[PDB]
Design an enzyme around this catalytic site. Structure first.
Site, PDB file in Angstrom:
ATOM      1  CG  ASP A 342      -1.990   0.975   1.239  1.00  0.00           C
ATOM      2  OD1 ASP A 342      -2.960   0.726   0.513  1.00  0.00           O
ATOM      3  OD2 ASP A 342      -1.910   1.989   1.968  1.00  0.00           O
ATOM      4  CD  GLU A 371      -2.014   1.704  -3.662  1.00  0.00           C
ATOM      5  OE1 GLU A 371      -1.754   1.840  -2.451  1.00  0.00           O
ATOM      6  OE2 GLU A 371      -3.038   2.162  -4.205  1.00  0.00           O
TER       7      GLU A 371
HETATM    8  O1  LIG Z   1      -8.092  10.699   0.453  1.00  0.00           O
HETATM    9  C1  LIG Z   1      -7.682   9.325   0.455  1.00  0.00           C
HETATM   10  C2  LIG Z   1      -8.087   8.684  -0.866  1.00  0.00           C
HETATM   11  O2  LIG Z   1      -7.879   7.267  -0.799  1.00  0.00           O
HETATM   12  C3  LIG Z   1      -8.195   6.649  -2.043  1.00  0.00           C
HETATM   13  O3  LIG Z   1      -7.526   7.309  -3.139  1.00  0.00           O
HETATM   14  C4  LIG Z   1      -6.670   6.400  -3.841  1.00  0.00           C
HETATM   15  C5  LIG Z   1      -7.219   6.176  -5.248  1.00  0.00           C
HETATM   16  O4  LIG Z   1      -8.566   5.687  -5.198  1.00  0.00           O
HETATM   17  C6  LIG Z   1      -6.300   5.214  -5.991  1.00  0.00           C
HETATM   18  O5  LIG Z   1      -6.745   5.070  -7.342  1.00  0.00           O
HETATM   19  C7  LIG Z   1      -4.858   5.737  -5.971  1.00  0.00           C
HETATM   20  O6  LIG Z   1      -4.802   6.942  -6.756  1.00  0.00           O
HETATM   21  C8  LIG Z   1      -3.623   7.009  -7.572  1.00  0.00           C
HETATM   22  C9  LIG Z   1      -4.026   6.800  -9.024  1.00  0.00           C
HETATM   23  O7  LIG Z   1      -4.577   5.492  -9.190  1.00  0.00           O
HETATM   24  C10 LIG Z   1      -2.827   7.005  -9.940  1.00  0.00           C
HETATM   25  O8  LIG Z   1      -3.224   6.837 -11.308  1.00  0.00           O
HETATM   26  C11 LIG Z   1      -2.240   8.396  -9.720  1.00  0.00           C
HETATM   27  O9  LIG Z   1      -3.181   9.392 -10.146  1.00  0.00           O
HETATM   28  O10 LIG Z   1      -1.916   8.569  -8.333  1.00  0.00           O
HETATM   29  C12 LIG Z   1      -3.022   8.403  -7.444  1.00  0.00           C
HETATM   30  C13 LIG Z   1      -2.544   8.656  -6.019  1.00  0.00           C
HETATM   31  O11 LIG Z   1      -1.997   9.986  -5.966  1.00  0.00           O
HETATM   32  O12 LIG Z   1      -4.443   5.995  -4.622  1.00  0.00           O
HETATM   33  C14 LIG Z   1      -5.262   6.974  -3.976  1.00  0.00           C
HETATM   34  C15 LIG Z   1      -4.666   7.369  -2.622  1.00  0.00           C
HETATM   35  O13 LIG Z   1      -4.689   6.237  -1.745  1.00  0.00           O
HETATM   36  C16 LIG Z   1      -9.702   6.741  -2.228  1.00  0.00           C
HETATM   37  O14 LIG Z   1     -10.145   6.035  -3.394  1.00  0.00           O
HETATM   38  C17 LIG Z   1     -10.077   8.208  -2.369  1.00  0.00           C
HETATM   39  O15 LIG Z   1     -11.502   8.324  -2.469  1.00  0.00           O
HETATM   40  C18 LIG Z   1      -9.550   9.011  -1.182  1.00  0.00           C
HETATM   41  O16 LIG Z   1      -9.648  10.407  -1.488  1.00  0.00           O
HETATM   42  O1  LIG Z   2      -9.519   6.334   8.901  1.00  0.00           O
HETATM   43  C1  LIG Z   2      -9.220   7.665   8.458  1.00  0.00           C
HETATM   44  C2  LIG Z   2      -9.337   7.768   6.938  1.00  0.00           C
HETATM   45  O2  LIG Z   2     -10.390   6.909   6.472  1.00  0.00           O
HETATM   46  C3  LIG Z   2     -10.658   6.991   5.063  1.00  0.00           C
HETATM   47  O3  LIG Z   2      -9.512   6.642   4.261  1.00  0.00           O
HETATM   48  C4  LIG Z   2      -9.722   5.375   3.630  1.00  0.00           C
HETATM   49  C5  LIG Z   2      -9.955   5.551   2.130  1.00  0.00           C
HETATM   50  O4  LIG Z   2     -11.121   6.354   1.859  1.00  0.00           O
HETATM   51  C6  LIG Z   2     -10.078   4.169   1.486  1.00  0.00           C
HETATM   52  O5  LIG Z   2     -10.307   4.305   0.078  1.00  0.00           O
HETATM   53  C7  LIG Z   2      -8.800   3.361   1.756  1.00  0.00           C
HETATM   54  O6  LIG Z   2      -7.694   4.020   1.081  1.00  0.00           O
HETATM   55  C8  LIG Z   2      -6.556   3.172   0.823  1.00  0.00           C
HETATM   56  C9  LIG Z   2      -6.709   2.473  -0.529  1.00  0.00           C
HETATM   57  O7  LIG Z   2      -7.782   1.518  -0.528  1.00  0.00           O
HETATM   58  C10 LIG Z   2      -5.393   1.761  -0.813  1.00  0.00           C
HETATM   59  O8  LIG Z   2      -5.430   0.812  -1.891  1.00  0.00           O
HETATM   60  C11 LIG Z   2      -4.309   2.812  -1.046  1.00  0.00           C
HETATM   61  O9  LIG Z   2      -4.570   3.683  -2.169  1.00  0.00           O
HETATM   62  O10 LIG Z   2      -4.138   3.507   0.193  1.00  0.00           O
HETATM   63  C12 LIG Z   2      -5.294   4.053   0.846  1.00  0.00           C
HETATM   64  C13 LIG Z   2      -4.873   4.343   2.284  1.00  0.00           C
HETATM   65  O11 LIG Z   2      -4.102   3.238   2.802  1.00  0.00           O
HETATM   66  O12 LIG Z   2      -8.640   3.250   3.180  1.00  0.00           O
HETATM   67  C14 LIG Z   2      -8.478   4.515   3.842  1.00  0.00           C
HETATM   68  C15 LIG Z   2      -8.188   4.330   5.332  1.00  0.00           C
HETATM   69  O13 LIG Z   2      -9.256   3.600   5.953  1.00  0.00           O
HETATM   70  C16 LIG Z   2     -11.047   8.418   4.690  1.00  0.00           C
HETATM   71  O14 LIG Z   2     -11.319   8.518   3.286  1.00  0.00           O
HETATM   72  C17 LIG Z   2      -9.895   9.345   5.052  1.00  0.00           C
HETATM   73  O15 LIG Z   2     -10.219  10.697   4.701  1.00  0.00           O
HETATM   74  C18 LIG Z   2      -9.620   9.222   6.548  1.00  0.00           C
HETATM   75  O16 LIG Z   2      -8.516  10.061   6.910  1.00  0.00           O
END
Ligand SMILES: OC[C@H]1O[C@H](O[C@H]2[C@H](O)[C@@H](O)[C@@H](O[C@H]3[C@H](O)[C@@H](O)[C@@H](O)O[C@@H]3CO)O[C@@H]2CO)[C@H](O)[C@@H](O)[C@@H]1O
Ligand SMILES: OC[C@H]1O[C@H](O[C@H]2[C@H](O)[C@@H](O)[C@@H](O[C@H]3[C@H](O)[C@@H](O)[C@@H](O)O[C@@H]3CO)O[C@@H]2CO)[C@H](O)[C@@H](O)[C@@H]1O
Ligand SMILES: OC[C@H]1O[C@H](O[C@H]2[C@H](O)[C@@H](O)[C@@H](O[C@H]3[C@H](O)[C@@H](O)[C@@H](O[C@H]4[C@H](O)[C@@H](O)[C@@H](O[C@H]5[C@H](O)[C@@H](O)[C@@H](O)O[C@@H]5CO)O[C@@H]4CO)O[C@@H]3CO)O[C@@H]2CO)[C@H](O)[C@@H](O)[C@@H]1O
Ligand code: CA
Ligand code: CA
Ligand code: CL
Ligand code: CL
Ligand code: CL
Ligand code: CL
Ligand code: CL
Ligand code: CL
Ligand code: CL
Ligand code: CL
Length: 646
Positions: A342, A371
């Site tokens: 992650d 990632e």
């Molecule tokens: O605010 C936390 C954030 O968590 C999750 O965002 C993740 C994206 O959903 C996931 O696709 C990935 O985003 C990356 C893109 O895939 C990649 O192409 C490039 O644009 O970099 C991105 C990360 O900067 O990871 C993010 C971060 O964990 C969740 O889905 C969101 O809703 C949420 O806002």
């Molecule tokens: O608990 C605090 C935190 O919760 C929420 O963050 C979650 C994301 O919304 C959720 O998509 C997931 O994000 C992870 C992606 O699935 C993963 O593949 C990668 O992109 O990293 C991300 C973080 O590890 O899980 C997080 C955490 O539960 C909420 O959206 C946040 O704003 C909040 O701060």
């Protein structure tokens, strides 16, 4: 959250936990952090350089009062030690430290077993948690990372649907049950997964995640979380066990799951989240050594490049050691076959390379992918383990988002089309992914040096499912047209160089009803819908046949960039299509040449083929009107594979 006291600096000779000099003074290198259990005696060692006092507090029950508090002795390099000359099995313990003017109490960061909701460390002989035959556990063979077919799955999703036919719903053991049946008698669970022919099951967080996400003492009420909120890195999640109150149960049952998967020919990849913790103020790290294990900005606030509130300071030596020893625990204690990191871009390159080095000493077939997103942090740019630095991270795979977006369209602009859905100008993006993300030539280049660094996918737990994304970007299409686009996207993943990655349920066009981020959505959103699977058995068989096609043809699984550059050739093809050949028995392919067409044009096309011999249809004959060996007549969206036989 309350107060963080960073310590009486007279304890550390005037050196603050934030001073660079701190990391010269207290770098303990021993292999005995945590509790070392014997019936003769239990030895405790805690790293806590800034504490002026340290105690072991003993408890008889996971919720009871302290039955004993024992002072620890200050030892070498910031550690504290204690030997209890009795059989401590069955007891619980915490550490109590005085840091500055306040007293903090915490679970052992090196906990190997815990009570319900992970609030106390459990003292246990781990040999008593081994399944019968664990010593003879053997891994299925794996010759190349490019031979893996990864299937990403959540333990609760797998079985919680009421018609899953699985007894231990939501539990590790639910994935050990054989002969399970669903609606209309279809295979479900383990038998469904082995029947697809995937090679690796990648499990969403199976380490212990926080009580705020799933309360392990209230499992009789609705609950769901992906689990990306780490609490105890080295112990399994309690809610996936049949008895979260029995510290041994979750350990034995996870080992039983791993043992059964291996016996059925499957490897296990663990999703690991070393980049952040569930709460930077409440985590044991901060109670025991405040200011050290998490990354701070220059103004002494948390760096929050994870958007979860905190980042782990992997680049500081004792945290680097913590992460490496944690991974080795999962490899050695639980026989895990791979790790998906992650937000790997939040981990530093030296840490990632040392992990890869230590795993190669044990078993080079153990997978490491992550990632590798480019994300801001106080960690300097040249140290982030992301795509921009992939040249410095040999043997480590990264999710290919360029290929993902080119195939199905922009995951963040929901209605935007991509290649499969008839968008314009996505062909080179698909070509870049076909070549494994390597520097193929000209504009066909991405971040990978070698195809083992590129993980291809069009669906994962994040963002919309492939079906839901197609729906949002094709409002004028019928579901039968969208099903063709969906099948094409899966075919592209499984015929591209690199490492193919499927999301559980992609085989039956998994939908979340349009939910974009389902991390805490109810089970109705997140379950594997075995009714939908029963209604999509043809699509499941199509996925099985695609996986079989890739296994039958090592030309799709070339191990090196030099091989790809010598054997892969892109052919003349019209807009909204991609065509290529894999020439000259590539990778040991039984056939002399392969020709692959990705046709995103729903109409009729007549295509010129390279004149390499007597082409014959191997896959996608349902799209082929005629083959003249050279010219191909096709109609409809889908993949076609031809071969020149030997
Ligand atoms: O605010 C936390 C954030 O968590 C999750 O965002 C993740 C994206 O959903 C996931 O696709 C990935 O985003 C990356 C893109 O895939 C990649 O192409 C490039 O644009 O970099 C991105 C990360 O900067 O990871 C993010 C971060 O964990 C969740 O889905 C969101 O809703 C949420 O806002
Ligand atoms: O608990 C605090 C935190 O919760 C929420 O963050 C979650 C994301 O919304 C959720 O998509 C997931 O994000 C992870 C992606 O699935 C993963 O593949 C990668 O992109 O990293 C991300 C973080 O590890 O899980 C997080 C955490 O539960 C909420 O959206 C946040 O704003 C909040 O701060
Ligand atoms: O074995 C020789 C075969 O190899 C290649 O076929 C591959 C297909 O191109 C590929 O699509 C995939 O086939 C899947 C299919 O996509 C999936 O939907 C399901 O097929 C169902 C059909 O939906 C159904 O109509 C029926 O099929 C009939 C078919 O209409 C008829 O023409 C004849 O061929 O008999 C078939 C049944 O025996 O039933 C099937 C089975 O439920 O499952 C298919 C198999 O997974 O995979 C194929 C390779 O496995 C060539 O392209 C093709 O020309 C060759 O005939
Ligand atoms: Ca938990
Ligand atoms: Ca390697
Ligand atoms: Cl296979
Ligand atoms: Cl449960
Ligand atoms: Cl970056
Ligand atoms: Cl568009
Ligand atoms: Cl790229
Ligand atoms: Cl449309
Ligand atoms: Cl026609
Ligand atoms: Cl030949």
């Amino acid at each position: 959250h309350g107060t963080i006291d960073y310590g009486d600096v007279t304890v550390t000779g005037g050196i603050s936990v934030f001073d660079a000099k701190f990391d010269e003074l207290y770098v303990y290198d021993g292999d005995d952090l945590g509790a070392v259990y014997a019936p003769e005696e239990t030895r405790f060692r805690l790293w806590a350089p800034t504490a002026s006092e340290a105690f072991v507090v003993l408890y008889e029950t996971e919720d009871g009062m302290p039955v004993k508090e024992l002072p620890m002795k200050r030892d070498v390099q910031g550690t504290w030690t204690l030997t209890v000359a009795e059989d401590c099995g069955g007891l619980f313990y915490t550490y109590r430290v005085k840091v500055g003017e306040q007293w903090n109490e915490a679970v052992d960061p090196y906990a190997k077993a815990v009570g319900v909701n992970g609030t106390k460390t459990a003292i246990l002989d781990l040999r008593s948690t081994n399944p019968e035959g664990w010593e003879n556990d053997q891994k299925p063979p794996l010759a190349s990372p490019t031979d893996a077919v990864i299937y990403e799955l959540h333990v609760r999703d797998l079985s919680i649907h009421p018609q899953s036919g699985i007894r231990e719903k939501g539990k590790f053991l639910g994935l050990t049950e054989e002969g399970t049946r669903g609606p209309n008698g279809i295979p479900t669970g383990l038998d469904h997964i082995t029947g697809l022919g995937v090679t690796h099951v990648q499990l969403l967080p199976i380490y212990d995640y926080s009580q705020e996400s799933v309360d392990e003492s209230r499992l009789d009420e609705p609950h769901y979380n992906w689990g990306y909120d780490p609490q105890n890195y080295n112990v399994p999640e309690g809610s996936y066990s049949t008895d979260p109150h029995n510290p041994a149960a979750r350990i034995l049952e996870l080992k039983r799951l791993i043992q059964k998967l291996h016996a059925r020919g499957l490897r296990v990849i663990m999703d690991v989240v070393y980049n952040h913790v569930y709460d930077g103020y409440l985590i044991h790290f901060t109670k025991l050594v405040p200011g050290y294990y998490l990354r701070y900005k220059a103004d002494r606030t948390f760096s929050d490049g994870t958007f979860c509130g905190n980042e782990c300071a992997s680049e500081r030596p004792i945290m680097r050691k913590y992460i490496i020893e944690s991974i080795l625990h999962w490899v050695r204690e639980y026989h895990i076959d791979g790790f998906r990191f992650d937000l790997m871009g939040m981990i530093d390159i030296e840490t990632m390379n040392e992990i890869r080095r230590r795993l190669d000493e044990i078993d080079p077939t153990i997978l490491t992918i992550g990632e590798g997103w480019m994300m801001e942090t106080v960690l300097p740019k040249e140290l982030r383990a992301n795509q921009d630095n992939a040249e410095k991270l040999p043997g480590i795979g990264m999710f290919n988002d360029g290929m993902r977006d080119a195939v199905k369209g922009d995951i963040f602009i929901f209605d935007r089309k991509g290649f499969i859905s008839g968008g314009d100008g996505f062909e080179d993006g698909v070509k870049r992914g076909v070549a494994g993300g390597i520097n193929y030539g000209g504009q066909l280049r991405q971040f990978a040096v070698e195809p083992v660094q590129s993980v291809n996918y069009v669906e994962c737990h994040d963002n919309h499912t492939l079906w839901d994304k197609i729906e949002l970007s094709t409002p004028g299409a019928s579901d039968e047209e969208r099903r063709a686009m969906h099948r094409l996207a899966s075919a592209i993943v499984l015929t591209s160089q690199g490492i193919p990655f499927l999301h559980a349920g992609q085989e039956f066009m998994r939908t979340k009803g349009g939910v974009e981020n389902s991390y805490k959505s109810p089970i109705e959103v997140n379950w594997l819908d075995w009714e939908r699977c029963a209604a999509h058995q043809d699509d499941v068989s199509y996925m099985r046949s695609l996986i079989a096609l890739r296994k039958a043809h090592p030309a799709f699984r070339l191990k090196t960039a030099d091989e790809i550059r010598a054997h892969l050739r892109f052919e003349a093809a019209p807009p909204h299509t991609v065509a290529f050949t894999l020439r000259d028995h590539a990778g040991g392919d039984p056939d002399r040449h392969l020709y692959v067409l990705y046709n995103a044009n729903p109409g009729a096309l007549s295509l010129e083929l390279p004149a390499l011999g007597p082409w014959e249809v191997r896959f996608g004959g349902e799209h082929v009107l005629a083959l003249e060996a050279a010219r191909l007549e096709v109609r409809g969206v889908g993949v076609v594979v031809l071969a020149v036989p030997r």
